[PDB]
Amino acid sequence: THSHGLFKKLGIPGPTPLPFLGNILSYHKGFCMFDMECHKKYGKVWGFYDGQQPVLAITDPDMIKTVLVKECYSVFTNRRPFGPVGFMKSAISIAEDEEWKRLRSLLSPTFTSGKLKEMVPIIAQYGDVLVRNLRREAETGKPVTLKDVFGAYSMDVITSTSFGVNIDSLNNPQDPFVENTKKLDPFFLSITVFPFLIPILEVLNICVFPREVTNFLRKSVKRMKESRLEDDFLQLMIDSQNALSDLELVAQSIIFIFAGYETTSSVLSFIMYELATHPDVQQKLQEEIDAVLPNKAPPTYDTVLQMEYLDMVVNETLRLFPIAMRLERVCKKDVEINGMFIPKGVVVMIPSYALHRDPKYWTEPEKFLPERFSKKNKDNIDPYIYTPFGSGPRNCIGMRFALMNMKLALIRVLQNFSFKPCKETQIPLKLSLGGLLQPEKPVVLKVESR
Ligand code: HEM
Ligand SMILES: CC(C)c1nc(CN(C)C(=O)N[C@@H](C(=O)N[C@@H](C)CC[C@H](C)NC(=O)OCc2cncs2)C(C)C)cs1
Ligand SMILES: CC(C)c1nc(CN(C)C(=O)N[C@@H](C(=O)N[C@@H](C)CC[C@H](C)NC(=O)OCc2cncs2)C(C)C)cs1
């Protein structure tokens, strides 16, 4: 509590904290409404308390670039330590300082022109299977849960690539793999307040995903490595096992497996929601696709980057729904950035969801307006207000892979389907309150052959 004076003594505005809890009860809205409202109410910069942890929100495009780009290596290197993680301490996105840079540059040779282009023929094989699955159940003519169908696609595409293991989640509605992956939670509430508990859970072996999902992979990612040793990602980590170790290999894998599944299916669900409620945009895209890939022609690496309107659509959706509600860097030593002292131990927070919807930088910002991304308007958009993939050395390592993957899936779907809203379809869309940005009710849409 003694810490609740920090932003008072520093002269920084904010909702005043309750003992122990901090500003926690404000998240009853949801982490996105809280932030939005705080922006409006306190202007450019403010402080709040995650239980006992001070978090300084910043909005200045300059000050943002300083902490994300210019001052990353020296002072803003790490994210918040977030729960009981155990061996997942070694995962890239969870690692800190030295073990990070090592892991980061050991893995960033993975998503590069070369690699990407090499993943295309494999990923585009599961585009074809997405078309099939959609068609079998458009016959039904009954609302389709996009997330399901997108999920199974997402699934097949990461495994098959980063490893080289086609797992066929698609001829298989029934699946030994996805079960383990995806698994009003008072658990993160009790830690996010009381972090003095955290080392206790570590000793007890209690981890944020059971000795069921990991004990699965422990041996399973062990499984995918072994058969290989006879006659990419899984590859490049074996370059380093001659210095990437046993569980270090497995922990990168889970981080990838998750990101590549969960994020990729949510955005693609959100986009199709958009296209369906904006049939004009859906048409314009379906033309561009048809103009670029004529005769139902299969999408390729170079044809994807040719597609300007598609990129506009992806971007505009990501403006409205940035699956990561905020970016964060823990300040590791005292600092004076753009005339603002920030004490050691503060968590600096960039509120991506809110800035993406700010009057100041977006005219009619609730409206889905892909045209705000055309070559004409493109350059009037600050790269520190628009941050769906974060920025600087700790940005999203999977960006390029994510975009192309989504687009490949978008292309084939549109080059053979139309999507309209029906009864169950939630209009307008309502985001769920929790950690990740999700639609509270699933995206269900009617699908028709072309
Ligand atoms: C559209 C889907 C995706 C969105 C919106 C997205 C967004 C992000 C954002 C905003 C960050 C944090 C940037 C920062 O903190 O400065 C991030 C970090 C990261 N993402 Fe992505 N991401 C997506 C897909 C992926 C994919 C496909 C992978 C890899 C397969 C991936 C792996 C990572 C990793 C490892 C980090 C931590 C990087 C580090 O600390 O070095 N995410 N993601
Ligand atoms: C307790 C039992 C019933 C279960 N709860 C769940 C909840 N669930 C679906 C889930 O996997 N969430 C878990 C979880 O780890 N959630 C938090 C901490 C995620 C952290 C944040 C949101 N990061 C994050 O994932 O950002 C997305 C990315 C962008 N680029 C690469 S990844 C937790 C609640 C088990 C599944 S099974
Ligand atoms: C706590 C209460 C309010 C609840 N929230 C939820 C939902 N929730 C926590 C959630 O959105 N979880 C989602 C989720 O993020 N999944 C988990 C598995 C991600 C865990 C991974 C290992 N997190 C992780 O470490 O990502 C690294 C990054 C952090 N920031 C940018 S990248 C899940 C539905 C896919 C259910 S109950």
From Swiss-Prot:
Chief place of localization: endoplasmic reticulum
Result of changing S190P: In allele CYP3A4*2; exhibits a lower intrinsic clearance toward nifedipine
Compartment(s) where it occurs, according to its Swiss-Prot or TrEMBL record: Endoplasmic reticulum membrane; Microsome membrane
Binding residues for heme: C396
Superkingdom as given in the UniProt entry: Eukaryota
Cofactor entry: heme
Mutagenesis or variant effect for V144I: In allele CYP3A4*9
Primary role: A cytochrome P450 monooxygenase involved in the metabolism of sterols, steroid hormones, retinoids and fatty acids. Mechanistically, uses molecular oxygen inserting one oxygen atom into a substrate, and reducing the second into a water molecule, with two electrons provided by NADPH via cytochrome P450 reductase (NADPH--hemoprotein reductase). Catalyzes the hydroxylation of carbon-hydrogen bonds.
Note: Chimeric transcripts, characterized by CYP3A43 exon 1 joined at canonical splice sites to distinct sets of CYP3A4 exons, have been detected. All are possibly produced by trans-splicing. The chimeric transcripts exist in 3 different combinations: CYP3A43 exon 1 joined in frame to CYP3A4 exons 2-13, CYP3A43 exon 1 joined in frame to CYP3A4 exons 4-13 and CYP3A43 exon 1 joined in frame to CYP3A4 exon 7-13. The longest chimeric isoform (CYP3A43 exon 1 joined to CYP3A4 exons 2-13) exhibits 6-beta-hydroxylase activity, while a shorter isoform (CYP3A43 exon 1 joined to CYP3A4 exons 4-13) does not.
Annotated protein name in UniProt: Cytochrome P450 3A4
Organism from which the protein derives: Homo sapiens (Human)
